[PDB]
Amino acid sequence: ELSNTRLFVRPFPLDVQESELNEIFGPFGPMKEVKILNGFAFVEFEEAESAAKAIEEVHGKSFANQPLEVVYSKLPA
Numbered sequence: 167e168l169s170n171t172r173l174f175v176r177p178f179p180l181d182v183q184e185s186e187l188n189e190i191f192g193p194f195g196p197m198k199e200v201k202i203l204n205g206f207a208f209v210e211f212e213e214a215e216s217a218a219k220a221i222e223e224v225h226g227k228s229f230a231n232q233p234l235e236v237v238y239s240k241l242p243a
Contacts, residue, residue, distance in 0.1 A: 172239030173209035
């Protein structure tokens with residue numbers, strides 16, 4: 167066990183929103199939470215299959231200027 171379901175998506179500046187995450191994460195299906203901060207997104211699902219595919223779709227791929235950490239994000243809240 168970890169957070170099992172959270173996409174730690176921080177390459178972008180203030181430009182990222184739930185609409186840009188809708189462009190990237192909408193292909194997976196789920197996107198149950200979409201916490202937006204000052205250059206950071208902490209997307210979330212209620213199960214580990216959207217996480218497994220989110221990882222294989224875009225973890226470590228270079229978005230905007232640097233790679234993603236679409237994973238079991240290191241935050242419990």
